[PDB]
């Protein structure tokens, strides 16, 4: 009823949307992994009379429910999707998207890692993002590669019209104690990549993590703090 949704407010197999700003929503879904339940976020950005989707809802059935919730709450067609790294919470559901007519995109690094690991593979390669600090425009957003952090391929997304910074899994929520799933992370490089984000987007008003509650710019410094602590 207005609060940011958690696993405890999202019915089973369900997706919820949350209005972040004019023409900007996050999507929230729940998934089980190795016997524990986790929330995860993605982004929806209005693109004229179409929508740009950032990240799947972590699974085929969750992503089908995401498309149904978008039709219910927004009613504009999702025409393109970007996955911000290769893990299942970002690409799981790309096959559903592709079969619904959505053009799916990711960096060549993400596509290679997804293919190697047996995850679903976005169709189109996003060039111009292979060097740390690189940025490219994609519809109503800017895509930014900050360097290795949560994964070597992780991208962040900025919505300039609303100063919304979607950090993906390279950014953690304020309540977080540890650095999440670090299986593919570069803990030594992560603080430097977060510094790049801070330097590039100092006017960000809302910061959205890959999992958990959005907040302000404080999420960036907090993420660096928890990552250095985990590393130590």
Ligand X SMILES: C[C@@H](c1cccc2c(-c3ccc(CS(C)(=O)=O)c(F)c3)c(C(=O)O)[nH]c12)N1CC(CN2CC(C)(N)C2)OC1=O
- Catalytically active residues are 85, 87, 89, 150, 181
Dihedral of CA 54/60/64/66: which sign?
negative
d(CA 17, CA 41): 9
Torsion sign (Cα): 90, 93, 79, 13: negative
Separation of alpha carbons 129 and 146, rounded Å? 9
Of the pair 47, 55, the CB lying nearest ligand X is at 55
CB of 210 to ligand X, least distance (A): 5
* Stretch of 41-49, 101-109, 154-162, 210-218 lying at the interface with ligand X (CB under 6 A): 210-218
User: Annotation-wise, does 89 bind a ligand?
Assistant: yes
124, β-bridge pairs:
105
Closer Cβ to ligand X, 46 or 90, answer by number:
90
184: contact with ligand X by CB under 6 A = yes
131 is an interface residue for ligand X by CB under 6 A: no
**Closest CB 59 distance from ligand X, rounded Å:** 10
Would you call 104 helix, strand, or coil by DSSP?
strand
Binding mask 202-231 for Zn ion (x = CB under 5 A): --------x---------------------
Is 93 a binder of ligand X (CB under 6 A)?
A: no
Instruction: Spell out the residues 6+ positions from residue 225 whose beta carbon is closer than 8 angstroms to its own.
Output: none
- Shortest distance in whole angstroms from residue 63 CB to Zn ion: 15
46 and 23 Cβ atoms separated by less than 8 Å:
yes
Q: Which residues are annotated as a binding site?
A: 85, 87, 89, 125, 127, 150, 169, 211
């Amino acid at each position: 009823s207005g609060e940011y949704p958690t696993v405890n407010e999202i019915p089973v197999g369900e997706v919820r949307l949350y209005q972040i700003a004019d023409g900007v929503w996050s999507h929230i879904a729940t998934q089980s992994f190795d016997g524990a339940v986790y929330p995860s976020n993605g982004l929806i950005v209005r693109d004229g009379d179409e929508l740009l989707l950032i990240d799947t809802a972590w699974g085929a059935k969750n992503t089908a429910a995401l498309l149904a919730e978008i039709e219910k709450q927004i009613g504009l067609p999702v025409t393109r999707a970007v996955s911000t790294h290769f893990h299942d919470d970002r690409v799981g559901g790309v096959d559903v998207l592709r079969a619904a007519g959505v053009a799916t995109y990711a960096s060549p690094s993400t596509r290679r890692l997804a293919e190697a690991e047996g995850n679903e593979i976005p169709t189109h390669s996003l060039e111009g993002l292979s060097s740390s600090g690189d940025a490219v425009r994609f519809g109503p957003v800017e895509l930014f590669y900050p360097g290795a952090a949560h994964s070597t391929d992780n991208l962040v997304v900025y919505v300039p019209s609303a100063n919304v910074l979607y950090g993906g899994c390279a950014v953690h929520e304020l309540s977080s104690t540890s650095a999440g799933n670090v299986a593919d992370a570069d803990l030594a490089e992560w603080p430097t990549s977060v510094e790049r984000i801070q330097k590039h987007y100092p006017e960000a008003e809302v910061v959205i993590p890959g999992h958990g509650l959005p907040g302000g710019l404080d999420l960036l410094q907090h993420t660096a703090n928890v990552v250095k602590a985990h590393k130590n």
